[PDB]
Ligand binder design. Structure first.
Ligand SMILES: O=P(O)(O)O[C@@H]1[C@H](O)[C@H](O)[C@@H](OP(=O)(O)O)[C@H](OP(=O)(O)O)[C@H]1O
Ligand SMILES: [Ca+2]
Lengths: 237, 219, 166, 788, 96
């Protein structure tokens, strides 16, 4: 039986009040939007490089968060240069090791109750939920955005939407699941509201709901080889 | 006004750590190999979590670059001392499995031990140097106990990878002159065994075993 | 045992007519509601009428109520959009009482069926799929306890039963 | 085997409660004797009067009525020095009936800790002042006796579907109002609480009678005399609980009786929970949620919101847990509880209700103070600079709605507090400050209204009796705070509109200075008024804001300037000497109390010695049967929900491991007193027929306890530890047993763990007890640095 | 190269947003929102062509080295040039 793995490439298809593939609004904008009428699982939209996400393991962020706090203009000193150099070196080593286990963890099966990060392939930006800001269109909801580097808000619990599978079971492609941030503690919700500047577009936020993120496989990790020709590649004839 | 008293969940750890140390005391072989793995359906690694507590209490890599001064305050010295002491008896004697479980852990807990003896603890050091003395003494004892007559090279290279040969030989002297400075006006180090004499001596002993797999260390 | 609805498949006689329903429990622990009328015996279809053999994913199964002795079969809904509903039949040799097991996770067609693995009842005579409705069958009373069960022509991945070992 | 009949074995249990009372009355006798001692001492003291009481003469009188004297034999039950009293409890301890032996273990704790149990009981007491105290005592006595007689005569004056019932209907009301009046007095403008009358009333126990009366079922459909009787009982209870903290704790034990959807029954609820940090730290979730469900079910009432406003902020200290918990359930409460006027259509309804409220003529206020309370409670529950509460509350009421309501001309001063201070607590007094506030000119639109309001308030020199106190409070506090927080905040300095509206700042500073000119300023509010002036002056100095020379000179000037007598004396000195004497006696028993606390473990170590030889009891005690059976009893003590007893037994048993044998001058004499009392008491209890004990070495004491099963007790308690205290005591006991690196206990632990497949609970408990600590410490240690 | 397609998509998005910005210019319906949003647009193009970070100084007081060889072609191909000078004269075409 096919199972999910680290490094797999797949899309997400919310089902419920609004059904459609989650996507973005270009590289200049950093807002996740689900488009209901653009397509379906049987009739995918014309453009299909916005809905692709690559699964990544949990990454440490303590040193990165500490460096971010240090970079905030709150403590200026002559001797602070050496401290900032040390913090930058620590962050560099932390990033290098994160990449090392990212290389070493590929192919491992994904089970319910684990922590995963979604990497948008087109924008190369992780999906994150900020815990200090509310949604632009929904006030009681919670803000969802993207970030190039990521933070503690990028960790996502994977949990079953059906009672068929329980925690500890491997995830089988084609099952509806529920995504929960570690810190926000609220499932990703496909709002029924309409964006003013774009017709049909629906905002994606973080609030308690009953929306299931049916994962749809697009390409396995093993097939993801740079030296071969694979679907979705762009080349010149 | 100013209570400065840590969470009760933190406090309950100290008697738990002491109780865990008491079973493993006297080199009771049946327990060092039992706490690590229990041969049950879902065995919990007590040694690994004990190391994880020390790793998290010190900030891990954030505190592994000379940040011991801020993390180590005048209130949690007892807890970290108990943690280090408890870690000591898990690997005392020829407990090879616990040595492998501690040195080859996925986390960077070994780095805190290695950098504990080098980096100072301010403002604790300038105010209470004696606490730094027994802290570094216990770190040195743990570092000696992790080797503990071991012939393999993987543990030695694991310790040496995070610790260049130069600064060990340097800190040997940096732990020497002030030992005589204390005696210049009366040391009385027989009862106060935490004097820099034994502290530097233990590091020298550790370097003696470490040099067997480092062609540059003996220079 | 229905995994999602948390209810036990049951066959009983109401108003002098035998009906197959999904009984509704009345407490938090739905699994503990072990009833004596919910026992079903497995009959693997074989060419030799006196051979029972083992169970395979591709094998054909027949289910017979232990207490009553009736077979589980599908027939056209008199109301008819669930065209087919599950009932009890005394006759056994008909092909209308033949079912197939679809595992939730993909497994080979020549593997031994585990005793307690979730399966989907794939009907074979009509080539439909089992589906749990939500329409109680006893309208004359006040508290619905019995719910009719039907067949969905399109496959659903949430209506997987559980083979509870007795 | 040997099935003793239950009906005959219950007999000893029935004697146990006899022992309880005959031990309890001895405490009353001892405190009576202690009172007589002070009677004599004050009689010999006041006659001479340089006033100090003869403590060295008090001590032997106190110690002669407690033990070791000729007249101390009647206090001892068996008139044999207590030798034969202990053996019955010890023999009953081996019996196989759980509650019987549970009571038997409780008896000996009281028997040994007589000195301790006497001193707290004597220190909790009270006494009468003048003839007024006697009159109050008598009146409360007759009132309570008469009320109790009617309580037991309830079925005669109660309609279950002048006459005696008619006479009672009236006569009960006067006594209830008398009991209510005795609690709290009212002055001209200050409500003070009488701390001595409430103490006398609680000592009497009128609360039990009132609670029993409230418990009686009733029908409010027809008889309103009963309804007002119950309301009067609630009023008395509210007055009883008002002004004190321990009364609230006493009434907290019947919270399950007060889970009713009634109005005044709920009015008692906030009085129970007012101004009590410790009591509100353990609030019940169910009651809080049930109040909101009552709002959603039984209409909109302010009695339900007063409780929430009280519990969210108790003792003036912000409560983060309650603040989060309120909106944890407010979201699911729907729009029935949360009603807000946001759009123009609802704002028109708000204004049309506001005009009629300005008329104050009927049917407008009930919806008016309810909304006021909702907004104020949101403000109070959004303090603490907590992100969760403020983000969730922003949706219900945005800045635009507050601006619209405050800028409207019909905004009465009371409304200005309700929304302006909520705006402060929702946007300004926030950890994550919203930059839209400081980058918008709406704040200046609010300054304009504040300027006009301050001009109105300062121009109130035409009618002093009609001056608005609420408006004065608003001017003195809310504007001052919302300006001080704005200007002093370094983040708000990034706004570029500071230098674009100088003329309004000139008049704003003039008005803030003019507020100081008012003669009605309270001393507390004057500091708030001056803080804003100082902040504005510092901001002007730092930013070089252009200010007229006259106003700057005014600010600089303000900164630079800134028979009966003897009768009263006798009892007044008596009362304050009682505390001194109680403290002195309590101090001079600690060197003695640990003596018998050690006699506990002394007797438990050698229980066979007390009973005469050639007997079955001594035979079973000599083999360790007593401790062995007590171990299985303590195993199940926690099962029957007996936490205090289990803790007091584990702590006492842990004393078997501490081997100690005996300002330094005081410690020497105290230790010698303790040894002198311990030796005589132990020798009296023992009565063995120049002796040395020769205690066995500490190395084998642990092994002896191991053989009795104490190895199993610790493991089983740790697996089934439902409380932190029990688990902590088990850990301390296990540490004490394994001291010195004993190998017998280690091997016993190893064999028990390897021979039981259920050690998974043990190890999971240990794993989780540190995982929680790791989760807490990760969020605790975050300080970075700030340089020297 | 995986970066070339990202660069092309970024350039095309910056072109299409300005297409809608200037489409309503003739009718004069551009407001502060359509002015505030497009205000931050211009800062992106300079660092897209230069490929550097923000120096923290005034945006107009930065003198750069030789521009990128290929991205200059990308702006001309993707019609960014058609709108880069249309934006500057756009407010003059607006009200007033
Ligand atoms: O615990 P109680 O007070 O005796 O009452 C139980 C309750 O009525 C349950 O609803 C019922 O299960 P069903 O609703 O499924 O009938 C159960 O029947 P059971 O004991 O036969 O399981 C009863 O025992
Ligand atoms: Ca494609």
């Amino acid at each position: 039986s096919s199972f999910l793995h680290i490094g797999d490439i797949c899309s997400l298809y919310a089902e419920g009040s609004t059904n459609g593939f989650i996507s973005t609004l270009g590289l200049v904008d950093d807002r996740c939007v689900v488009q209901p009428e653009a397509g379906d699982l049987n009739n995918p939209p014309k453009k299909f490089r916005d809905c692709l996400f690559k699964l990544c393991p949990m990454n440490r962020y303590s040193a990165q968060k500490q460096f971010w706090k240090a970079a905030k203009p709150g403590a200026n000193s002559t001797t602070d240069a050496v401290l900032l150099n040390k913090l930058h070196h620590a962050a560099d080593l932390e990033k290098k090791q994160n990449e090392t286990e990212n290389r070493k963890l590929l192919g491992t099966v994904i089970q319910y109750g684990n922590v995963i990060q979604l990497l948008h392939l087109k924008s190369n930006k992780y999906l994150t939920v900020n815990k200090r800001l509310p949604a632009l269109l929904e006030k009681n909801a919670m803000r969802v955005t993207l970030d190039e580097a990521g933070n503690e808000g990028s960790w996502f619990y994977i949990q079953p939407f059906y009672k068929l599978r329980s925690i500890g079971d491997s995830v089988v492609i084609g099952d509806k699941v529920v995504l929960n941030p570690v810190n926000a503690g609220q499932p990703l919700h496909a709002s029924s509201h309409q964006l003013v500047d774009n017709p049909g577009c629906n905002e994606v936020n973080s609030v308690n709901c009953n929306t299931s993120w049916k994962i749809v496989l697009f390409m396995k990790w093993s097939d993801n080889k740079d030296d071969i020709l694979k679907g979705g590649d762009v080349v010149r004839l | 006004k100013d209570d400065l008293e840590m969470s009760a969940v933190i406090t309950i750890m100290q008697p738990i750590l002491r109780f865990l140390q008491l079973l493993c005391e006297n080199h009771n072989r049946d327990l060092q190999n039992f706490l690590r793995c229990q041969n049950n359906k879902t065995n919990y690694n007590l040694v690994c979590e004990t190391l994880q507590f020390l790793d998290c209490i010190c900030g891990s890599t954030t505190g592994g670059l000379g940040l011991l001064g801020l993390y180590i305050n005048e209130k949690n010295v007892a807890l970290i001392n108990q943690t280090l002491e408890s870690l000591t008896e898990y690997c005392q004697g020829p407990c090879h499995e616990n040595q492998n479980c501690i040195a080859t852990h996925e986390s960077n807990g070994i780095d805190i031990i290695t950098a504990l003896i080098l980096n100072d603890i301010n403002p604790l050091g300038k105010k209470r140097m004696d606490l730094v003395l027994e802290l570094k003494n216990n770190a040195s004892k743990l570092l000696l106990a992790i080797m503990e007559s071991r012939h393999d090279s993987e543990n030695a290279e694991r310790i040496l990878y995070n610790m260049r040969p130069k600064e060990l030989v340097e800190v040997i002297k940096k732990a020497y002159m002030q030992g005589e400075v204390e005696f210049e006006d009366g040391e009385n180090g027989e009862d106060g065994a935490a004097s820099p004499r034994n502290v530097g001596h233990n590091i020298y002993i550790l370097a003696h075993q470490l040099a067997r797999h480092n062609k540059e260390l003996q220079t | 045992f229905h995994a999602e609805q948390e209810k036990f498949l049951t066959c009983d006689e109401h108003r002098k007519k035998q009906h197959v329903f999904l009984r509704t429990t009345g407490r938090q622990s739905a699994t503990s509601a072990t009833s004596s009328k919910a026992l079903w015996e497995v009959e693997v279809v074989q060419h030799d009428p006196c051979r029972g053999g083992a169970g395979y994913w591709n094998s054909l199964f027949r289910f017979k109520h232990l207490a009553t002795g009736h077979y589980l079969a599908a027939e056209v809904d008199p109301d008819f959009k669930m065209v087919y509903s599950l009932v009890s039949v005394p006759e056994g040799n008909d092909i209308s009482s033949i079912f197939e097991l679809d595992p939730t996770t993909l497994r080979g067609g020549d593997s031994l069926v585990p005793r307690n693995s979730y399966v989907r009842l794939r009907h074979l005579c009509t080539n439909t799929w089992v589906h749990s409705t939500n329409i109680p069958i006893d309208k004359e009373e006040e508290k619905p306890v019995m719910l009719k069960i039907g067949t969905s022509p399109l496959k659903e991945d949430k209506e997987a039963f559980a083979i509870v070992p007795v | 085997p040997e099935k003793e009949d239950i009906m005959v074995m219950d007999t000893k249990l029935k004697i146990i409660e006899i022992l309880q009372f005959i031990l309890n009355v001895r405490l009353d006798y001892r405190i009576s004797c202690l009172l007589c001692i002070f009677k004599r001492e004050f009689d010999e003291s006041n006659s001479q009067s340089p006033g100090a009481l003869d403590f060295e003469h008090i001590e032997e009188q106190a110690e002669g009525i407690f033990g070791g004297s000729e007249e101390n034999t009647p206090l001892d039950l068996d008139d044999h020095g207590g030798r034969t009293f202990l053996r019955v409890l010890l023999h009953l301890t081996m019996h196989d009936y759980p509650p019987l032996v549970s009571g038997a273990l409780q008896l000996l704790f009281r028997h040994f800790s007589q000195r301790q149990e006497v001193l707290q009981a004597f220190k909790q007491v009270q006494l009468l002042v003048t003839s007024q105290d006697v009159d109050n005592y008598k009146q409360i006595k007759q009132d309570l006796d008469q009320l109790r007689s009617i309580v037991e005569k309830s079925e005669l004056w109660v309609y279950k579907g002048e006459s005696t019932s008619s006479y009672n209907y009236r006569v009960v009301k006067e006594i209830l109002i008398r009991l209510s009046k005795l609690c709290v007095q009212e002055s001209a403008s200050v409500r003070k609480s009488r701390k001595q009358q409430q103490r006398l009333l609680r000592n009497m126990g009128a609360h039990a009678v009132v609670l029993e009366l409230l418990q009686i079922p009733y029908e409010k459909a027809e008889d309103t005399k009963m309804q007002e009787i119950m309301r009067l009982a609630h009023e008395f209870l509210q007055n009883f609980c008002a002004g004190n903290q321990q009364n609230q704790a006493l009434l907290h034990k019947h919270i399950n009786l007060f889970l009713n959807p009634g109005i005044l029954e709920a009015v008692t609820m906030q009085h129970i929970f007012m101004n009590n940090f410790q009591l509100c730290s353990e609030i019940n979730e169910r009651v809080v949620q049930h109040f909101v469900h009552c709002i959603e079910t039984h209409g909109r009432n302010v009695q339900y919101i007063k409780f929430l406003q009280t519990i969210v902020k108790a003792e003036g200290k912000f409560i983060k847990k309650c603040q989060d918990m309120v909106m944890a359930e407010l979201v699911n409460s729907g729009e029935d509880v949360l009603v807000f006027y946001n759009d123009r259509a609802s704002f028109q309804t708000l204004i049309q209700m506001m005009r009629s409220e300005r008329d104050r003529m009927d049917e407008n206020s009930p919806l008016f103070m309810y909304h006021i309370h909702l907004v104020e409670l949101l403000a109070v529950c959004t303090e603490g600079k907590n992100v969760y509460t403020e983000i969730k509350c922003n949706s219900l009421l945005p800045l635009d709605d507050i601006v619209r309501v405050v800028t409207h001309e019909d905004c009465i001063p009371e409304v200005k507090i309700a929304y302006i201070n909520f705006l402060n607590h929702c946007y300004v007094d926030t950890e994550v400050e919203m930059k839209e506030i400081y980058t918008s000119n709406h704040m200046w639109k609010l300054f304009e209204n504040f300027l006009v309001d301050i001009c109105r308030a300062c121009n109130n020199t035409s009618d002093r009796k009609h001056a608005d106190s609420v408006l004065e409070k608003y001017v003195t506090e809310i504007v001052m705070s919302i300006v001080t927080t704005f200007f002093s905040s370094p983040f708000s300095d990034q706004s570029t509109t500071l230098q674009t509206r100088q003329p309004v700042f000139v008049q704003l500073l003039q008005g803030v200075f003019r507020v100081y000119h008012c003669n009605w300023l309270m001393p507390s509010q004057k500091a708030s008024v001056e803080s804003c002036i100082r902040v504005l002056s510092d901001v002007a100095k730092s930013r070089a804001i252009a200010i007229p020379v006259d106003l700057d000179s005014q600010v600089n000037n303000l900164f630079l300037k800134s028979s009966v007598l003897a009768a009263s004396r006798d009892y007044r000195n008596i009362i304050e000497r009682l505390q001194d004497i109680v403290s002195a006696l309590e101090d001079r028993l600690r060197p003695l109390v640990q003596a018998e606390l050690s006699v506990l473990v002394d007797v438990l170590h050698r229980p066979e010695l007390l009973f005469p030889e050639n007997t079955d009891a001594r035979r079973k005690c000599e083999s360790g049967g007593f401790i062995c059976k007590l171990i299985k009893h303590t195993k199940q003590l926690l099962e029957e929900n007996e936490e205090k007893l289990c803790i007091k037994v584990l702590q006492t048993l842990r004393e078997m491991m501490t081997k100690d044998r005996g300002p330094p001058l005081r410690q020497l004499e105290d230790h010698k007193r303790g040894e002198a009392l311990r030796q005589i008491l132990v020798n009296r209890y023992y009565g063995n027929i120049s002796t040395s004990r020769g205690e066995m070495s500490l190395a084998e004491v642990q092994c002896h306890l191991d053989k009795e099963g104490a190895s199993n007790l610790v493991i089983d308690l740790i697996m089934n530890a439902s409380s932190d205290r029990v688990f902590h005591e088990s850990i301390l006991l296990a540490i004490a047993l394994l001291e010195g690196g004993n190998t017998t206990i280690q091997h016993s632990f190893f064999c028990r763990l390897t021979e039981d497949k259920k050690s998974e609970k043990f190890f999971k408990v240990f794993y989780d007890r540190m995982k929680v600590a790791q989760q807490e410490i990760k969020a605790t240690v975050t300080v970075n640095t700030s340089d020297l | 190269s995986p970066a070339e397609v990202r660069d092309l998509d970024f350039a095309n998005d910056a072109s299409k947003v300005l297409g809608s910005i200037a489409g309503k210019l003739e009718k004069g319906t551009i407001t502060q929102n359509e002015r505030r949003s497009v205000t931050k647009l211009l800062e992106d193009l300079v660092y897209f062509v230069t490929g550097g970070t923000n120096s923290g100084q005034d945006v107009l007081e930065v003198v750069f080295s030789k521009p990128n060889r290929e991205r200059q072609k990308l702006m001309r191909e993707q019609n960014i040039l058609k709108q880069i000078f249309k934006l500057l004269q756009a407010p003059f075409t607006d009200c007033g």
